[model samples]
Target: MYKIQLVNQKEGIDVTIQCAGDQYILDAAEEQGVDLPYSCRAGACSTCAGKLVKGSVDQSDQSFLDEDQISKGFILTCVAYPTSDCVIQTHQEEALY
Candidate 1:
């Protein structure tokens, strides 16, 4: 299992969640009763976007975010699966419009 850490404006400290390597990160969060912002469960929406602060993930095919954004650690949680323990921060400056 991979340990997922989430840092958001709503919380001052890290929120931890356990995730399986084969399971999607968003699914794990929902299972843990963690409320995160999301619209489309697919990678087509940027609503679930966050920055990978620590560790890695295997993301599904996506079209909404560009190559630069992904390289800069941007991820769509709905389609992001844990590759290793990860730390992510929500509510980035990038606006999806």
Candidate 2:
């Protein structure tokens, strides 16, 4: 199982997730009732922006990341799969570069 740490921007929804390797970050958040801030489960929206503080992530062909954000390890959690155990900070609203 991939471990997930979801930190929310709206306050106090941070949570720990333990699930199978195939589970997506979005799925984990939804299952955990984490108020993670999202629109579509597909990668078409910007609603899933988050700081992927630790571990690598697979974008699942849903990569909406630009260079600067990608370099800083930001990610779209909708289609994200933890390549290793991870910690994440998420918000419904974010800066767009």
Candidate 3:
């Protein structure tokens, strides 16, 4: 299983998910009721920006964000996937689908 977590956004929400690695991070977040910010889940926009706290993620494309941001752990949740377990610091409230 691939472990993932969304930072505590709202009151009393501990976002974590253990799911198949082939699943999209945003989709997994939504499935587990973790309100991760995402607009176009198809990687068309930056509304789905998130930070990869620990672990490696293979993404579709990460050019919308800068290299500095990438190095800082910034990632777009739309196309993110875990090659291993991951932790995501969520920002928006009610961002889940």
Clashing pairs in 2: none
Instruction: Give the lowest summed-lDDT range of ten residues in model 3.
Output: 88-97
- Cα lDDT tens digits, model 3, 1-97, are 7988667545355667886778878888788766666776776567887777788787756456667766777777778777888877765322321
TM-score of each: 0.88, 0.84, 0.78
Q: Runs in model 3 with CA error above 4 Å?
A: 9-12, 92-97
Ranking of predictions according to lDDT:
1, 2, 3
Note the Cα lDDT for every prediction shown.
0.83, 0.76, 0.70
- The sequence of per-residue lDDT tens digits that candidate 2 reaches over residues 62-88 is 756777877787788888878899988
TM-score of 1: 0.88
Best prediction by lDDT: 1
What's the C-alpha lDDT at position 28 in model 3?
80
Task: Give the higher-lDDT candidate: 2 or 3.
Answer: 2
Q: Pick the candidate with the highest TM-score.
A: 1
> What ranking emerges by TM-score with the best candidate at the front?
1, 2, 3
Residue-wise C-alpha lDDT for candidate 1, range 1-97, written one tens digit per residue: 9999988876553689999988888889889888777888888978888889999999966567888888889988888899999999966536433
In candidate 2, which residue ranges exceed 4 Å CA deviation? none
Clashes of 2: 0
RMSD (Å) of each candidate, 1 decimal? 2.0, 1.9, 4.3
